[PDB]
Design a protein around this ligand. Structure first.
Ligand SMILES: [Ca+2]
Length: 136
């Protein structure tokens, strides 16, 4: 597979110094975007520059065990925006990473961390994403 998201422009909400939005598409699963002052909601958008077939996305967090509530949406050149993964009511431990089928042409990826459920090992963690890949 080829990660067509790699080095694509990331826009979105404010970031902690040292942990910019650009860390979402740098290809490094260890480099993070972290929301500034741990603000929620926090959001990131990847511009794929026009419509590109995407088989699936991968959303990577720093490590397993957060309890973020989040959603992933895709959009085409049309303006048709659509939710592909909705974990906004999540209360359980999160996996380290999520595969998400798309199987169509898309032009943008939108990730939003809307909240966090109580408990687990990292209950004061700030909203943060290690990587989003778009495989074709
Ligand atoms: Ca990264």
């Amino acid at each position: 597979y080829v990660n067509i998201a790699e080095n694509k422009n990331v826009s979105g909400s404010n970031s902690q110094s040292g942990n910019p939005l650009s860390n979402i598409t740098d290809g490094d699963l260890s480099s993070l975007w972290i929301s500034d002052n741990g603000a929620m909601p926090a959001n990131a958008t990847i511009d794929l520059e026009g419509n590109n077939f995407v088989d699936f996305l991968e959303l990577h967090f720093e490590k397993e065990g957060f309890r973020f509530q989040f959603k992933v949406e895709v959009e085409d050149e049309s303006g048709n925006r659509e939710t592909v993964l909705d974990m906004t009511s999540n209360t359980e431990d999160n996996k380290k990473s999520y595969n998400i089928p798309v199987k169509k042409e898309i032009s943008k990826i939108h990730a939003t961390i809307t909240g966090k459920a109580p408990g687990g090992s990292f209950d004061q963690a700030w909203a943060a994403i290690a990587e989003i890949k778009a495989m074709s």
